[PDB]
Amino acid sequence: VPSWPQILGRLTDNRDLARGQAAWAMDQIMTGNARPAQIAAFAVAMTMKAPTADEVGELAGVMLSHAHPLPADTVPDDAVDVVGTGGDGVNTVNLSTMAAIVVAAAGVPVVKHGNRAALSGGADTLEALGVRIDLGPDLVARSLAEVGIGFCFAPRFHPSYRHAAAVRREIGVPTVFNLLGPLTNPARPRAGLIGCAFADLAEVMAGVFAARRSSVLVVHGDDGLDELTTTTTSTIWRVAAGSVDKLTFDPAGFGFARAQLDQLAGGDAQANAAAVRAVLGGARGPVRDAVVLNAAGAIVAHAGLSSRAEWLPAWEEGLRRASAAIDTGAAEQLLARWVRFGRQILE
Amino acid sequence: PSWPQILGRLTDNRDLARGQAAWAMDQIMTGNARPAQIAAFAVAMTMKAPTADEVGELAGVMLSHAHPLPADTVPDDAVDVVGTGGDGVNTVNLSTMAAIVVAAAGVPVVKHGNRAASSLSGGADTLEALGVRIDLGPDLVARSLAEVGIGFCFAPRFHPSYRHAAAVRREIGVPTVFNLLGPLTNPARPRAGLIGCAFADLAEVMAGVFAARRSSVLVVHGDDGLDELTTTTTSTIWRVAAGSVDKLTFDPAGFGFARAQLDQLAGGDAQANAAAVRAVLGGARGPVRDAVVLNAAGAIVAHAGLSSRAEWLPAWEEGLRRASAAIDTGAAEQLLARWVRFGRQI
């Protein structure tokens, strides 16, 4: 007998939902049948109760069922995502976006799910670099084939999420909905480096990826970043073979100096675009270090699709590959090809 | 102050800073809060567990927007008999019947009330079915009180600015902190009350709110879940007076009441619950009468806590004698007839 009073009452009683209940709520939300008050009540109550992997998997699966897919056979079986929840409140340079370009230039297909900022988000910085972010399925697929990277603009691919997105903006507070972006990449890559700004939810995210048998590293810098940080240690939930394994990660062990958080600070889209250019041009410093680290992490997750290689050697090769992709010019070249691809669409 | 700040604080499981609940409630009451913001606030405050101070801000803000009764029309010793509802049992209208009995005993009653939310017939629905006019404005409620000894303030008529919150309450269905506010926002502001709370955890908070007012109240929760003094088992009573609270366990067997079953108090539609009122006021004996008498006496005890040095036990004994006598002498039946007549001569 599924209804808002039943489901909200259950959450306010601090109980886990029965199977199917989160799915019912999400189909109400995605069909436009949930009133803004019902959407908001649900988002908040799920959050304060503490969502489970099963519940979030129901939310994400329903949401994915409403998303526009890419055309059949256009996403390589070994594509990776590099993306985070955002909401770390630190306003850094676009680490996930830089790492994605490096990863793709290392020869790993990247299909990025992303969006604007909620100063300058991945999407905004890409636009300032000349990249066309609002392409439909056919052209993302083409971009992926021809350039080795594509970008799925969330509003383009998840039109039915617009009711939920407006509630999110109205209430402001982070909720369980902040987890859905990384879990609803419409290209469904099976590997990724996934940042989570909320330490208490990284494990849940990992659990959802583990139920899908994805090869993923869910990461949270112990300084609060939804990225692998160089300012201190990070916690990594390693997902492979459908099991989650919690780990502490210290970059110092690979020879990385401790950086300060303000060394990674970003600005507007133009500032962040120049930061991307600096790093791809091979400039040394904390930003490159951070990009290389996150790129290596994605490469490590990609490796887990076809092996269970030892952790430390996987990382060493990951960092080497990331570093080479920059220093051979491959990463700077890939960004140029990507811009060129978007400019060809007109004719 | 902002919604992101206040909501973040609540989702972090922190009590709000002084003034923040008031800011939120005033946004809600002025129509400046989006329905999503109203719902988030209501749910987050509920799951955090509201404090007495926070609820006092909510109710106090809500009262600042209400229509008052005209000056000098509510006696100093008027009493309310009302609860949160939401007890899920769909009993007969015990508070409403108790209110009639209390007025018939000679205690001024200004009842706050509203239609049913989850039950089949709320107090207002039942009063309407009895022929009492529930839709009177401040002036005529004050007249009812002077001329009949009882008045009824219908929440939608006295709290028009609460309409945005009320609608969100309906849309989400789940009980929230807002369900506490009815009993705390009687627009006539009576200083005494028998106030039922269906939520064991929140009764204490409601008592706290009354403690900070100039009030003599019994906040009551039946240990079977009723938002009334129950006859099926003990009740917890938060006795409020002089700015403090005395929590105690109350057992009506001490006054010779037989233990009843919950099903014996079950109500039906407005016509059914109206028939139950007429039966009780006509002298019919049984579990329902017993519960009405018990709650009427509770109200009379709260009233005595205003200007009477009577101690707890003697007060109860007197309250029970008065409540029973109001029924048996026909006074309560007569008062209801008078209340209906009053309404028809307008």
Ligand SMILES: O=P(O)(O)OC[C@H]1O[C@H](OP(=O)(O)OP(=O)(O)O)[C@H](O)[C@@H]1O
């Ligand atoms: O505005 P916020 O809520 O803080 O989120 C900042 C960014 O983090 C996420 O992107 P992603 O990880 O793809 O991009 P980035 O790390 O390259 O910025 C999100 O889609 C935003 O672009």
Ligand SMILES: O=P(O)(O)OC[C@H]1O[C@H](OP(=O)(O)OP(=O)(O)O)[C@H](O)[C@@H]1O
């Ligand atoms: O439908 P529910 O949410 O359970 O509410 C039942 C009733 O409880 C409250 O009234 P009150 O204590 O005045 O009425 P009573 O005579 O029914 O006790 C409320 O105003 C409802 O009328």
Ligand SMILES: Nc1c(F)cccc1C(=O)O
């Ligand atoms: N942010 C959005 C999204 F992620 C999906 C669909 C719509 C929106 C939106 O802001 O309208």
Ligand SMILES: Nc1c(F)cccc1C(=O)O
């Ligand atoms: N229940 C209401 C109330 F208590 C105040 C204002 C409006 C309503 C309503 O039911 O719409």
Ligand SMILES: [Mg+2]
């Ligand atoms: Mg990121």
Ligand SMILES: [Mg+2]
């Ligand atoms: Mg980030």
Ligand SMILES: [Mg+2]
């Ligand atoms: Mg009642």
Ligand SMILES: [Mg+2]
């Ligand atoms: Mg009741």
